[PDB]
Design a protein around this ligand. Sequence first.
Ligand SMILES: Nc1ncnc2c1ncn2[C@@H]1O[C@H](COP(=O)(O)OP(=O)(O)O)[C@@H](O)[C@H]1O
Lengths: 51, 43
Amino acid sequence: AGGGFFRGSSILVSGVAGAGKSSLAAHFAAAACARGERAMYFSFEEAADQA
Amino acid sequence: LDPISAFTESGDRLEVQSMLLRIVDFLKNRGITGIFTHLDAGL
Ligand SMILES: Nc1ncnc2c1ncn2[C@@H]1O[C@H](COP(=O)(O)OP(=O)(O)O)[C@@H](O)[C@H]1O
């Protein structure tokens, strides 16, 4: 309801290997970048070029 | 690497993960294809 999460909020994309957590996070980031804001991606298991 | 499960017994919680990550990153940087067989956690 309302059409989205709250801004200053925390979101947990819980899953297992092969679920798509990283891609959902990347979609969040792409939303931020397309709306003119800045986003950060802290990868701990993947190179940035690989991402 | 067959099997990467052998090193589980001979190492602590973080040291085994660090060793495996070292090998993974080495093969990645040199561009080698890395086949890893295991007998699976965050691995
Ligand atoms: N072109 C594509 N078409 C359909 N599925 C895809 C495509 N590219 C990637 N995937 C799916 O994305 C998944 C990987 O998601 P990923 O973000 O790596 O999740 P996690 O990082 O949590 O394992 C794979 O299971 C794969 O099936």
